[PDB]
Design a binder for this molecule. Structure first.
Ligand SMILES: *[C@@H]1O[C@H](CO)[C@@H](O)[C@H](O)[C@H]1NC(C)=O
Ligand SMILES: *[C@@H]1O[C@H](CO)[C@@H](O)[C@H](O)[C@H]1NC(C)=O
Ligand SMILES: *[C@@H]1O[C@H](CO)[C@@H](O)[C@H](O)[C@H]1NC(C)=O
Length: 532
């Protein structure tokens, strides 16, 4: 037969088990027969099977060395199959190893017929023109090899993501990717033509790769594979093995695309030919998490609001409409901050029911606190207009307005934009599909109402209540500034605006407690009465 290639380890690599494998490869190639060429190919495949079954000291090597060895082994297997392919007559050649390694070969004359080959692991529909070769005048050579336990060699493999592929993935996930963990599905490991120049195809070729299930039952009787449910943080790879100058080799996905997956199969279309395999690759991505600074600041604001609520609940001299409004505004702020601490973080998952509920209650607590501030302004207006006679406004109407107007707004918005609640990064509203206008509508309308109320109250007072109007205006400004800076903490790469948001929460709690409780004299007298 024709001269066989000498199989050598990669330079600088020492391994006794691999040397034992290559010595048998060389001796078999020395003693191979023309009628045993396809036997020689199967024997080489069985030697690969034994090498997998006896990993030895290969795993003790560096991963880049192991990947380089695996690339060399698959390349040599392609070379020896190509060499002995011309030694075989025309026709298909299909063999299954006792270690369940499938190899398909096919020899036909030159032509442009659409040829669909494959038995179990894969189905390759290719144009036969490229199988003949650009310069080879002999019969066309093409084949597919599938080996199941490259995990012996391809452990902790690396995936090189293309720049535009990274840009698309980060647009999909809306932040950076730490890395990729690779879990393959198929045993397909080699697709080759007659000539070695298969780096580019003038026409894409379709493949139907099936993924074997490692069942412990009788072989050949298993049903077709059940489809794996795709998760949020994972997408399906029609990948190939490409050598690398720095780490031996890596997985790559460019030039290939996914078309569908059913009956235990995945349909891929590729612009080139190489070692193809289907990966079920989970992407490791960091999730936006509140910093310790922000958590401590929110805890301090919660403490201040708790002191406020206890004071407004227990100090009996100060009971009134203003105290009721401050009580309920502090309650809404406390509940909103508690929900923010407990559920703004989305721990690297999809937008579930809990995340959507957290976004809904955050919006409700927002609108309720804002409407209770508006109620405080409205009662100041009513007090000034009636020239301080009184009777206020009943707490039942106050609780209807400040807890039902937000309920109506949130219910309507969640009935229209149910998909706009919760994001994969944080449990807060998403402003796509015109949700920004529908969210700023009620907010800007109540801002306009508050501004009208405050300017009318100031105008009426110009013709102790001016101090209350100033305090209400400053409190509204502080709450609005806190919320506005609470919307830009998620976007910013450098969390310097989170410092401002934390400081604004701290100042909001301190402002409420100082102005409404500490600077109050009846509150202090009640405090010393309790502490006596
Ligand atoms: C493949 O063989 C390795 C040992 O070399 C073993 O750890 C692994 O579980 C096997 N996997 C399958 C699917 O046989
Ligand atoms: C990746 O390699 C590390 C050792 O660096 C090992 O602890 C870990 O189990 C490996 N994980 C996979 C999926 O190979
Ligand atoms: C393959 O699955 C589809 C449903 O996705 C089913 O309609 C079809 O009958 C199945 N065929 C085989 C051979 O399992």
């Amino acid at each position: 037969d024709m001269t066989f290639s000498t199989w050598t380890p990669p330079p600088g690599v020492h391994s006794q088990t691999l040397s034992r494998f290559f010595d048998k490869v060389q001796d078999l190639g020395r003693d191979s027969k023309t009628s045993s060429a396809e036997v020689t190919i199967q024997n080489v495949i069985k030697l690969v099977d034994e090498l997998m079954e006896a990993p030895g000291d290969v795993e003790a090597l560096a991963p880049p060395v192991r990947h380089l060895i695996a690339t060399q082994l698959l390349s040599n297997l392609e070379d020896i199959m190509r060499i002995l392919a011309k030694s075989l007559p025309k026709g298909p050649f299909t063999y299954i190893s006792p270690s369940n390694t499938e190899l398909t070969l096919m020899i036909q004359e030159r032509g442009d017929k659409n040829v669909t080959m494959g038995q179990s692991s894969a189905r390759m529909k290719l144009n036969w023109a490229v199988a003949a070769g650009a310069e080879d005048p002999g019969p066309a050579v093409a084949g597919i090899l599938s080996i199941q336990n490259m995990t012996t060699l391809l452990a902790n493999a690396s995936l090189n993501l293309h720049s535009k592929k990274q840009a698309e993935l980060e647009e999909i996930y809306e932040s950076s990717i730490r890395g990729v963990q690779l879990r393959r599905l198929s045993a397909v490991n080699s697709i080759f033509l007659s000539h070695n120049n298969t780096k580019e195809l003038n026409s894409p070729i379709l493949f139907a790769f099936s993924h074997l299930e490692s069942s412990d039952g009788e072989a050949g009787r298993d049903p077709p594979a059940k489809d794996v449910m795709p998760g949020p943080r994972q997408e399906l790879l029609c990948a190939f093995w490409k050598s690398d100058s720095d780490r031996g080799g890596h997985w790559a996905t460019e030039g290939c695309q996914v078309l569908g997956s059913k009956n235990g199969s995945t349909t891929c279309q590729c612009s080139s030919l190489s070692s193809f395999a289907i990966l079920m690759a989970h992407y490791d991505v960091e999730d936006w998490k509140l910093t310790l600074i922000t958590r401590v600041g929110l805890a301090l604001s919660l403490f201040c609001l708790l002191l406020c609520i206890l004071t407004f609940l227990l100090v009996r001299p100060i009971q009134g409409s203003r105290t009721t409004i401050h009580l309920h505004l502090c309650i809404c702020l406390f509940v909103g901050s508690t929900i923010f601490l407990a559920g703004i973080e989305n721990e690297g998952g999809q937008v579930g029911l809990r995340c959507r509920l957290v976004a809904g209650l955050l919006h409700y607590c927002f609108l309720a606190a804002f409407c209770w501030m508006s109620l405080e302004g409205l009662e100041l207006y009513f007090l000034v207009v009636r020239v301080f006679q009184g009777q206020g406004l009943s707490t039942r109407w106050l609780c209807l307005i400040g807890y039902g107007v937000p309920l109506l707004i949130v219910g309507v918005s969640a009935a229209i934009y149910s998909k706009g609640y919760g994001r994969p990064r944080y449990c807060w509203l998403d402003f796509e599909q015109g949700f920004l206008w529908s969210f700023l509508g009620p907010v800007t309308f109540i801002i306009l109402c508050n501004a009208v109320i405050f300017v009318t109250t100031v105008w009426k007072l110009t013709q102790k209540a001016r101090a209350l109007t100033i305090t209400a205006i400053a409190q509204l400004f502080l709450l609005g500034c806190t919320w506005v800076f609470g919307l830009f903490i998620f976007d910013d790469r450098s969390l310097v605006l989170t410092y401002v948001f934390t400081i604004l929460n701290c100042l909001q709690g301190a402002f409420l407690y100082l102005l409404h409780c500490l600077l109050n004299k009846k509150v202090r007298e009640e405090y010393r009465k309790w502490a006596c």
